[PDB]
From Swiss-Prot, chain A:
Name assigned to this protein: Lymphocyte antigen 75
Known tissue expression: Expressed in spleen, thymus, colon and peripheral blood lymphocytes. Detected in myeloid and B-lymphoid cell lines. Isoform 2 and isoform 3 are expressed in malignant Hodgkin lymphoma cells called Hodgkin and Reed-Sternberg (HRS) cells.
Disulfide-linked positions: 17-37, 139-153
Subcellular localization: Membrane
Organism for this UniProt entry: Homo sapiens (Human)
Glycosites: 33, 237
Miscellaneous notes: Isoform 2 and isoform 3 are produced in HRS cells by a transcriptional control mechanism which cotranscribe an mRNA containing LY75 and CD302 prior to generating the intergenically spliced mRNA to produce LY75/CD302 fusion proteins.
């Protein structure tokens, strides 16, 4: 369970010890970090051979449809499951595994499974979808693997559960949703790519401190398949700089001193703002580079 | 040595046609050289490469440079000149890097079409790496083996050079008319097969006592002509102790070796007779 955003995986050419990190109710709670383990940390779980987190849950083992289970357990003033927190998702999944079945979860869409939404009326802050080529209908279920399988819920599951409880700072960004296949010479084309759109348009450069939080809050809007963030740091003049002829002021390095001499690398933005650099040996990480990623370049 | 600067001049006169004074790695900027010559990174000067010319402001212009010509034969006869150091020109740099006849065995991959990145990731190992050709006879042998293995239509990811490149430019070669595609790279994101592999006979110099780390102290006196002090006899230790008075208590004797191991050669090509 190593999410490829905080660990550099490549041809590896002072001990190392790992740990589990929590980010105060984050959509990626449970990440695995690695550091030197000479320091002092905490240990809580040790492995040997219904109310929950200010919420209430009720499970019924009846085999009924979605509308039918809603009308069934709604008589007791209860609303179907709507996952909005990682701990709630983990508890629902462990309860489903203890019940040994895939139970109902409650939501509905409006326009051809394009705008999904819970029945509570809260802004989307959590996304744990399973696959991209599975969105055949406009409903979802929880599987054994703990993901969100997009299916039709006009069927009979062995049970149900229901619960009770852009211009910004003198710059304009843009998002491109197309399909591309160019996998060569990715260091002398982005400038002329954004310059053809409109004059006075350069690649995204960070000259402030509130733009990071702004783009972070703007990211989790269409993140059904988007999980990584790209940056404009590449091989420039035998160093790790931007594309334009300008020096760097805000360092975006993880730790130590990187010495990447390759023509390109992966400068990634974390979930909370951890500066991350990943040296790549295969080019099979470009999905995720130009098709459904952030290709925003400022105008000023 | 002088062979290195002659090779650099050959490389700068063969690939380049015009004549212009880019720069040469000769510097007499600091006044503390006391007439000698300095350097910047692990380069003890031992050859005569800088002449002397009288000038009204000879002590101001302190960046030496020679001239490269449009002729293929330039054996030291270069125009010497001296300029200042307040210029501003974009980067042009260098960094320290610290059975087929005439070659080792070459592993040719077949029925497995991978790109350049997948090739350099899969075929390379602790002893394996991208096999580069350094000789023309080896290149002819590679061409014959390619023509006898697959044919003239296939393309192979080959690294072309005249010296073995170190791992510490997506070139390809075809069996037919390799003379035109020697240095013409294309988009290497295609699946194709590939191949994969004073004292007696001893003088001393002293410098400013400015302190610095040992990783950087290996290039403090190496700027001048000489190496770090290596004790070979007790007379050398007596000389060191006799020159110690005007120095501090600490001194960089200058030898590096990993812990829990042995010391080897004193990093200056000197055997151990005693310690």
């Amino acid at each position: 369970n190593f999410h490829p955003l905080l660990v550099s995986g490549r041809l590896r050419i002072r001990y190392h010890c790992a740990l589990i990190l929590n980010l105060q109710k984050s959509p990626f709670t449970g990440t695995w970090n690695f550091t030197s383990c000479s320091e002092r940390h905490f240990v809580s779980l040790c492995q040997k051979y219904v109310k929950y987190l200010n919420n209430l849950y009720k499970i019924i083992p009846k085999t009924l449809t979605w509308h039918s289970a809603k009308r069934e357990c709604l008589k007791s003033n209860m609303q179907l499951v709507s996952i909005t927190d990682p701990y709630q998702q983990a508890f629902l999944s462990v309860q489903a595994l203890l019940h040994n079945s895939s139970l109902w979860i409650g939501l509905f869409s409006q326009d051809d499974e394009l705008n999904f939404g819970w029945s509570d009326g809260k802004r989307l802050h959590f996304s744990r979808w399973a696959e991209t080529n599975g969105q055949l209908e406009d409903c979802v279920v929880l599987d054994t693997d703990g993901f969100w399988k997009t299916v039709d819920c006009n069927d009979n599951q062995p049970g149900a559960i229901c619960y009770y409880s852009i211009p910004f700072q003198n710059c304009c960004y843009n998002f491109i949703i197309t399909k591309n296949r160019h996998m060569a010479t990715t260091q002398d084309e982005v400038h002329t790519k954004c310059q053809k759109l409109n004059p006075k348009s350069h690649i995204l450069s960070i000259r402030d401190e509130k733009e990071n939080n702004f783009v972070l809050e703007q990211l989790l809007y269409f993140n059904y398949m988007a999980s990584w963030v790209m940056l404009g740091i590449t091989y420039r003049n035998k160093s790790l700089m931007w594309f334009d002829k300008t020096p760097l002021s805000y360092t975006h390095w993880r730790a130590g001193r990187p010495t990447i001499k390759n023509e390109k690398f992966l400068a990634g933005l974390s979930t909370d703002g951890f500066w991350d650099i990943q040296t790549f040996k295969v080019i099979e990480e470009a999905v995720y580079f130009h098709q459904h990623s952030i290709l925003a370049c400022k105008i000023e | 040595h002088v062979d290195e600067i002659k090779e650099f001049l050959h490389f700068l006169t063969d690939q380049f046609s015009g004549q212009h004074w880019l720069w040469i790695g000769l510097n007499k900027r600091s006044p503390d050289l006391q007439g000698s010559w300095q350097w910047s990174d692990r380069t003890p000067v031992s050859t005569i490469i800088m002449p002397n010319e009288f000038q009204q402001d000879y002590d101001i212009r302190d960046c030496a440079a020679v001239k490269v010509f449009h002729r293929p034969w330039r054996r030291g006869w270069h125009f010497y000149d001296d300029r200042e150091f307040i210029y501003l020109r974009p980067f042009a740099c260098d960094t320290k890097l610290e059975l087929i006849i005439e070659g080792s065995e070459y592993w040719f991959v077949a029925d497995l079409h991978l790109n350049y990145e997948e090739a350099v990731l899969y075929c390379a190992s602790n002893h394996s790496f991208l096999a580069t050709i350094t000789s023309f006879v080896g290149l002819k042998a590679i061409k014959n083996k390619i023509a006898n293995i697959s044919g003239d239509g296939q393309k192979w990811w080959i690294r072309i050079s005249e010296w073995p490149i170190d791992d510490h430019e997506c070139l390809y070669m075809s069996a037919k008319t390799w003379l035109i595609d020697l240095g013409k790279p294309t988009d290497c994101s295609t699946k194709l097969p590939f191949i994969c592999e004073p004292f007696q006979n001893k003088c001393f110099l002293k410098i400013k006592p400015v302190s610095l780390t040992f990783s950087q102290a290996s290039d403090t006196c190496h700027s001048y002509g000489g190496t770090l002090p290596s004790v070979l006899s007790q007379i050398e230790q007596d000389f060191i102790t006799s020159l110690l008075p005007d120095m501090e208590a600490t001194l960089w004797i200058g030898l590096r070796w990993t812990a829990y191991e042995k010391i080897n050669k004193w990093t200056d090509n000197r055997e151990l007779t005693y310690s």
